[PDB]
Amino acid sequence: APCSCDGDRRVDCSGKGLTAVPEGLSAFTQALDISMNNITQLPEDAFKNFPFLEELQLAGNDLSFIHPKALSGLKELKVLTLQNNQLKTVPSEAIRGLSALQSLRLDANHITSVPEDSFEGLVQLRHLWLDDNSLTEVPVHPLSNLPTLQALTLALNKISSIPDFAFTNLSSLVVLHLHNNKIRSLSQHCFDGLDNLETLDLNYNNLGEFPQAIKALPSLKELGFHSNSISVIPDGAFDGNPLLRTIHLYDNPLSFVGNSAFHNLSDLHSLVIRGASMVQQFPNLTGTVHLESLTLTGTKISSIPNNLCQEQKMLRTLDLSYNNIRDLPSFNGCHALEEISLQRNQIYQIKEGTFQGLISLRILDLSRNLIHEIHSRAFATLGPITNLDVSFNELTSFPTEGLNGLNQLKLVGNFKLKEALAAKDFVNLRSLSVPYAYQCCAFWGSQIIIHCTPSTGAFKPCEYLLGSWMIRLTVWFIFLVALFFNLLVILTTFASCLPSSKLFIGLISVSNLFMGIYTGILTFLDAVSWGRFAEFGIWWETGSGCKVAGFLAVFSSESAIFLLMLATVERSLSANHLKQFRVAALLAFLGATVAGCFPLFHEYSASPLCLPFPTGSLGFTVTLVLLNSLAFLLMAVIYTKLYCNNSQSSMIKHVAWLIFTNCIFFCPVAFFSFAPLITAISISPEIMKSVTLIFFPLPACLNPVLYVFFNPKFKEDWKLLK
């Protein structure tokens, strides 16, 4: 086939790379399609062989120059297309005989300018396209020869401004597109004569002032000018546009908006305003009763008018975030509204009648406010609510009537909400997020799974504080032994009436007795609250008892590591000083106090075991660990010198055993104290909590044991005591 064909008397020579006009075709060819080839010019009477031509298509052909008699002879074709070409100037002297055109597609061309005598004889054209071009000005004079043009596009060009009386002859214009353009300014009377204009396009431009000249476009129904540089919509700017019904103005530096500028718009269907910070009061909405959305964000208004919902009967979406509203009105008569999103405001209270008559509500966003009280019956009138977001407020008690269908609930940030909510009034709940991890223990941490957020575990226990009945029974002996044997050592040491060795041993017995007092407090708490801990956990962690428990635990643990680093400096120094060793044993019992009194003011609240480093803030924990490690290193370094260096032989043996036991028993706690750094090969918190719970009070359990059944001076002093 010289050239691919079809059965509707049409030749479709696409995809062939012709270098000339096809020949030998039928004289009855209805449409000549020769697109996507490589011909650059046509001789005269190139299309004389086709007297009955209607649809000529040579787009994507890359024409360069046209002979001013080649296209002649076509006195009856309809649509001419020459896009994706490189025509520098319009065939103005060649389109004179093209008197039967209906659409001239000269877009996607290299047109830089049109001549004055263009568009003559085209009295039947309907569509004009000059898109993706390089025209510097609007062709006013040539456009004057188009009295019946129906749709004109002038976008993607290099025009900077449109002068006055530049569009009078286009009496049948209906579509005007000027997007991705550079025009900056326009005159008062530039747009006159377009009485039939219905859709106007000006977006993606740079007009710095409101195009007030739109007062003469009565038939405008779509108005898009978004992504511009406008900052004030004046007062009364849409008087001449009553049939208008869709405004586009988003992404602009709108700073101020007039109070009565949005009135008498009966066909408006949407309204979005974000960033008008200079607006102080709610706009006048008289005459606009068919609107479906009000998105007023970034504004300083303070009071919702008390009758929007008796006038806007078709409202569906209400978004008033990022405002300064303080008082909320009655929402009765808002039947079709389903998208209330009042957030980032200054509302402080919710009344009974605030949310009455809302039968179609489905979304609520009352977060980031200062609501301190909510009525019990407030939510009893609502219908099929699904989302309720009240997080990050100042609530103390949460009503529960009429919230059985809440699919998703959010409550985080209400720190003063101590009361624990029940699981009977939220049977149809899918996602919950509460202020304290122990309020989640009542939804179980059937068919579907809730997903609580502050998450429970073993360092935030939900039934037992200690663990199984093995960690329980061993903490009960470490308490009994550390109490009774320490009391016995104190009694025999400080009631025989001392040298500077015996006094130090008695003081390390006092600081072990206080540690035993701390672990006893822990086991009584576990015992009282057996079988349930949610009831007592909130009262314990946010209470004041945890402060005393932590004070005793840290004080007993660091007053016995500095009273054993001063007892190695009294043996190395026997290789005089009764006064000084007695005034340095007060500065060890008062230096210890500072550390505990300290975490009490600046923490003891990240575990129920009330310690500072079971887990680890990167403050007190790392400092305690570093100080204890250096003291133990120096303690061994000092004794190492004495190691290489009667009653003196018996005391040396006792202090060496004390230092070995205390060094050995401390390594598990130090090693597992750095849990986040190494995760202990993804060790379970339950397992490591156990070992940091048993092995921590252990050293202050055999110090008075080792000393009472294996040291010569305990026998003698016992006998001088009877």
Side-chain angles (χ1 to χ4, degrees), residues 568-577 581 642 645 648 652:
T568 317
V569 183
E570 200 265 342
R571 306 237 109 272
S572 178
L573 272 160
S574 178
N576 289 284
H577 321 148
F581 284 119
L642 165 40
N645 198 0
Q648 33 165 11
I652 278 193

Side-chain angles (χ1 to χ4, degrees), residues 619-635:
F620 190 57
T621 296
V622 58
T623 312
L624 270 202
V625 158
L626 183 155
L627 202 148
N628 290 357
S629 41
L630 80 93
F632 270 119
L633 161 72
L634 183 164
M635 210 171 285

Side-chain angles (χ1 to χ4, degrees), residues 138-140 143 162-170 189-192:
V138 285
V140 164
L143 267 198
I162 327 163
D164 40 297
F165 293 61
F167 277 138
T168 78
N169 288 100
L170 302 196
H189 304 316
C190 68
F191 267 137
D192 276 299

Side-chain angles (χ1 to χ4, degrees), residues 27 118 168 331 387 391 515 543 566 588 712:
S118 302
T168 78
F331 281 108
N387 288 79
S391 64
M515 171 65 78
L566 258 163

Side-chain angles (χ1 to χ4, degrees), residues 419-443 445-468 471-498:
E419 188 70 9
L421 58 141
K424 155 170 51 54
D425 321 328
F426 295 85
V427 86
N428 201 192
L429 202 146
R430 200 77 40 81
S431 151
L432 183 102
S433 129
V434 277
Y436 292 119
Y438 285 97
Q439 316 210 111
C440 282
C441 282
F443 292 113
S446 289
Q447 237 213 7
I448 215 15
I449 304 296
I450 310 92
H451 165 78
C452 227
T453 273
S455 219
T456 36
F459 260 128
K460 267 308 182 321
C462 222
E463 226 175 4
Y464 311 98
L465 173 46
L466 275 66
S468 185
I471 303 301
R472 185 176 179 83
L473 182 40
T474 299
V475 159
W476 271 93
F477 177 80
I478 296 175
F479 162 49
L480 281 196
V481 157
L483 188 62
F484 274 65
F485 275 56
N486 261 324
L487 261 193
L488 180 65
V489 178
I490 281 197
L491 199 31
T492 86
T493 281
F494 284 129
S496 178
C497 295
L498 281 143

Side-chain angles (χ1 to χ4, degrees), residues 242-265:
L243 271 163
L244 168 135
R245 88 175 63 268
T246 151
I247 324 190
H248 299 297
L249 52 90
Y250 64 92
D251 163 69
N252 271 357
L254 288 208
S255 204
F256 184 62
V257 184
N259 71 68
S260 301
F262 275 120
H263 91 252
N264 256 359
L265 287 202

Side-chain angles (χ1 to χ4, degrees), residues 200-216:
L200 190 55
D201 184 358
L202 285 159
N203 66 348
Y204 284 145
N205 233 303
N206 34 31
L207 311 99
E209 62 275 5
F210 194 73
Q212 158 274 0
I214 52 167
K215 216 68 54 183

Side-chain angles (χ1 to χ4, degrees), residues 317-443 445-450:
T317 290
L318 209 55
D319 194 327
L320 315 178
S321 63
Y322 294 164
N323 281 10
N324 270 353
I325 308 196
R326 158 152 289 269
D327 172 353
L328 285 165
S330 319
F331 281 108
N332 83 7
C334 263
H335 298 163
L337 167 79
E338 327 162 359
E339 214 67 18
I340 282 151
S341 55
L342 292 132
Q343 90 196 315
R344 283 304 316 198
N345 272 32
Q346 274 157 35
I347 311 162
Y348 81 108
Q349 197 212 343
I350 309 294
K351 305 250 290 183
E352 38 183 53
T354 324
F355 281 175
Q356 183 175 202
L358 286 187
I359 86 186
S360 294
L361 206 56
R362 284 172 30 253
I363 272 283
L364 211 36
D365 203 309
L366 271 193
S367 68
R368 282 311 165 99
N369 279 23
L370 311 173
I371 313 144
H372 80 109
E373 173 200 343
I374 302 184
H375 213 175
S376 50
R377 293 203 41 81
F379 293 93
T381 289
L382 295 171
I385 196 156
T386 283
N387 288 79
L388 170 54
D389 166 34
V390 78
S391 64
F392 274 139
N393 277 359
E394 208 156 49
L395 261 167
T396 88
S397 178
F398 193 76
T400 38
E401 200 148 319
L403 289 185
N404 313 50
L406 266 191
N407 254 305
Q408 167 184 132
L409 185 55
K410 308 164 77 160
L411 274 166
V412 297
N414 307 28
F415 276 139
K416 290 172 16 184
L417 183 62
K418 225 58 66 173
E419 188 70 9
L421 58 141
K424 155 170 51 54
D425 321 328
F426 295 85
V427 86
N428 201 192
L429 202 146
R430 200 77 40 81
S431 151
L432 183 102
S433 129
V434 277
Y436 292 119
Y438 285 97
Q439 316 210 111
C440 282
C441 282
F443 292 113
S446 289
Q447 237 213 7
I448 215 15
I449 304 296
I450 310 92

